[PDB]
Design a protein around this nucleic acid. Structure first.
Length: 94
DNA sequence: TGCATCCGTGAGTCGAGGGTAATAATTGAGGACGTAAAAAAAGCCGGATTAACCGGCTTTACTGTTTACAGAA
């Protein structure tokens, strides 16, 4: 499982470096670096699901300024309970 | 004892119209009492609203295996 996934990861890293102006071969260093600092065991790579919901609520209350909460339920289709919890959360943070 | 006098009795299934009518006075007063109309309950009726979720994906903690270079007749 490791070889093909590592190869694709290196391909994407070098593509992103080329897009950003960095030399693609520098990606090897990057992956080597992460291969030193990310080991320890077996765990699947996902995303920031907590951060995904965090930025979702961020966008929700950035678009929210009143009645457009209904538009929020029309934006993607979500509950008013989570929207109200997110509003209270944005009130909590300063 | 003969006489009038009175009192039940006497068929049955069926159909189609099925209702008609001699007569008659007005005032006044008084009160009851029904019925609309307009207003409070009051009773839901519409639209947002905070706290109950209970299956399910995603890491940590183990768990029985799966190979090629060092030890024993």
């Amino acid at each position: 499982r490791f070889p093909a996934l590592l190869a694709e990861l290196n391909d994407l890293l070098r593509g992103e470096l080329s897009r950003l102006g960095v030399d693609p071969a520098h990606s090897l260093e990057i992956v080597v670096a992460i291969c030193k600092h990310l080991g320890g065991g077996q765990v699947y790579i996902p995303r920031g699901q907590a951060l995904d919901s965090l930025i979702r609520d961020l966008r929700i209350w950035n678009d929210f300024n009143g009645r457009n909460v209904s538009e929020l339920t029309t934006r993607y289709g979500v509950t008013f309970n989570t929207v109200y919890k997110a509003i209270r959360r944005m009130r909590r943070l300063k």
